[PDB]
Amino acid sequence: NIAEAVQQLNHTIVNAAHELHETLGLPTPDEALNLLTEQANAFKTKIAEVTTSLKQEAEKHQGSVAEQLNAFARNLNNSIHDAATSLNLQDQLNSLQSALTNVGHQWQDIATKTQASAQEAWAPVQSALQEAAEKTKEAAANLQNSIQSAVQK
């Protein structure tokens, strides 16, 4: 189930990243920079939301799942914090593209983990993980919609 969610996330992310490159076709090298920074911030905002809600969840469980859950969240947060920092279009673009890529990889990691647990250890936090995956997918679809609408007018 998570597997699915996570698979759908990936596709989303992959595409979104492709589009990032079309920000370069914008009128000014300034317009785009502002656009990007904005988008990056919107994303960052959302990913951090998830991180916080998953941290909360972890607080309710025992064992290594809770540990690992809290960890995942922390990590998601680390791959985004510094993504709208660069002072130029170039670095900005690189930064976002990476940030996006790292969020996807981290999602795959945790998905695989849950899958490899024969004792079904992750079952107890499945809903939370799923919702979070959805929220991440939306953030990335939203971003894409933006890079798209700003390149059609």
Swiss-Prot record:
Protein's cellular compartments: Secreted
Sorted UniProt keywords: Glycoprotein, Lipid transport, Repeat, Secreted, Signal, Transport
Primary location recorded for the protein, binned into one broad class: secreted
Chain positions covered by the region annotation Disordered: 129-153
Extent of the Sequence repeats: 6-16, 17-28, 29-36, 37-54, 55-65, 66-75, 76-85, 92-103, 118-128, 129-142, 143-153
Residues carrying covalently attached carbohydrate according to the record: 10, 77
GO cellular component: extracellular region
Tissue: Hemolymph.
Comp. bias (Polar residues): 142-153
GO biological process terms on file: lipid transport
The protein's role, per its UniProt record: Assists in the loading of diacylglycerol, generated from triacylglycerol stores in the fat body through the action of adipokinetic hormone, into lipophorin, the hemolymph lipoprotein. It increases the lipid carrying capacity of lipophorin by covering the expanding hydrophobic surface resulting from diacylglycerol uptake. It thus plays a critical role in the transport of lipids during flight in several species of insects.
Family the UniProt entry places it in: Belongs to the insect apolipophorin-3 family.
Quaternary structure and interacting proteins, as annotated: Equilibrium between a soluble monomer and a bound lipoprotein form. Apolipophorin-3 associates with lipophorin during lipid loading until each particle contains 14 molecules of apolipophorin-3 in L.migratoria (5 molecules of apolipophorin-3a and 9 of apolipophorin-3b).
Extra facts: Two isoforms of apolipophorin-3 (a and b) have been found and occur in a ratio of 5a:9b in the hemolymph.
Protein name: Apolipophorin-3b
Organism this protein belongs to: Locusta migratoria
Organismal lineage: Eukaryota, Metazoa, Ecdysozoa, Arthropoda, Hexapoda
Residues shown, of full length: 25 to 176 of 179
